[PDB]
Amino acid sequence: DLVEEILRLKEERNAIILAHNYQLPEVQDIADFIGDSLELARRATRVDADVIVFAGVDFMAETAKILNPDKVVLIPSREATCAMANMLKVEHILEAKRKYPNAPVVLYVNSTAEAKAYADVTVTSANAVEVVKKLDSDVVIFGPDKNLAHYVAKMTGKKIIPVPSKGHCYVHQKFTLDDVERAKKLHPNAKLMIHPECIPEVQEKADIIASTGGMIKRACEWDEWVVFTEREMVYRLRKLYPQKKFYPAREDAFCIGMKAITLKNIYESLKDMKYKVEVPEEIARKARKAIERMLEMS
Ligand SMILES: N/C(=C\C(=O)O)C(=O)O
Numbered sequence: 001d002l003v004e005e006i007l008r009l010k011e012e013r014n015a016i017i018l019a020h021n022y023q024l025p026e027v028q029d030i031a032d033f034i035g036d037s038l039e040l041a042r043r044a045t046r047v048d049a050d051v052i053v054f055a056g057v058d059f060m061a062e063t064a065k066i067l068n069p070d071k072v073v074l075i076p077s078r079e080a081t082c083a084m085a086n087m088l089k090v091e092h093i094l095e096a097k098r099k100y101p102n103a104p105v106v107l108y109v110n111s112t113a114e115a116k117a118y119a120d121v122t123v124t125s126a127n128a129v130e131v132v133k134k135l136d137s138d139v140v141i142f143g144p145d146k147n148l149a150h151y152v153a154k155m156t157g158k159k160i161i162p163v164p165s166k167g168h169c170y171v172h173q174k175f176t177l178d179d180v181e182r183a184k185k186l187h188p189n190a191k192l193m194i195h196p197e198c199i200p201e202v203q204e205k206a207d208i209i210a211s212t213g214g215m216i217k218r219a220c221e222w223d224e225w226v227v228f229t230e231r232e233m234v235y236r237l238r239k240l241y242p243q244k245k246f247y248p249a250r251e252d253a254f255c256i257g258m259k260a261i262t263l264k265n266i267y268e269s270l271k272d273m274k275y276k277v278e279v280p281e282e283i284a285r286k287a288r289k290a291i292e293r294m295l296e297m298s
């Protein structure tokens with residue numbers, strides 16, 4: 001009975017479980033808070049727990065550690081990684097920063113703490129449009145996702161410099177126009193939730209374009225949705241709105257890094273206090289300054 005033992009160990013450790021929307025259904029059923037990365041980290045800043053067990057990928061647990069340095073942030077598996085965030089290196093930021101020294105370095109939250117030390121302001125897939133448009137410069141260095149960069153470039157009108165060149169998410173890259181055509185034929189009455197990390201030609205056929213947190217907010221606008229993101233988001237939406245109907249655009253659209261977290265290693269995470277996520281004091285200083293600047297900009 002892992003559920004019973006995890007709940008006991010969670011109490012004995014004075015811990016709180018934070019799970020991303022892409023986590024397995026069994027993981028979400030035992031989580032205290034569920035949402036996207038920045039929300040989960042921002043919800044922990046008002047909470048007294050000694051330990052944070054972050055059911056998510058590496059950069060998410062890092063962000064929680066930067067915003068909660070007084071807590072022990074545990075990751076159940078060091079293999080829970082984001083393939084897109086690891087594509088962006090500091091050699092890529094310093095390169096574009098040499099040719100555009102007046103362009104601010106805007107980095108997606110899906111990035112390493114080391115990369116955030118060179119960023120002037122972080123952004124999520126929910127506030128990227130307003131933050132970039134509120135910036136003083138017309139040139140913006142944006143990464144690592146080039147598909148989100150295209151969406152921000154199309155909404156703000158400012159020329160976006162994507163960094164790196166081929167930075168993208170392989171999960172949301174799976175969605176093609178044939179998946180859009182297949183959805184409209186299987187569910188003709190359903191609207192289309194499409195994540196901004198999808199390719200632009202898929203974005204332009206969406207009913208709404210929003211992050212997983214935005215999909216939850218704007219789900220009330222219709223009773224039937226086809227979800228173009230990680231498949232485990234469908235379970236999250238079904239638990240929140242049981243009266244509505246949700247369908248995955250692709251069942252094979254799954255994140256290996258997210259699936260590295262199971263109910264077993266969460267139990268072992270609380271038992272052995274592993275694996276601790278630490279961020280250099282140096283790096284957490286500048287990375288937090290970019291996050292707090294994002295929060296001051298909504
Ligand atoms: N972009 C989000 C998750 C991810 O990229 O893994 C989100 O929840 O908005």
Ligand code: SF4
Nearest residue numbers: 082083084169171255
């Ligand atoms: S889905 Fe794409 S972006 Fe979100 S975590 Fe898995 S890999 Fe990184």
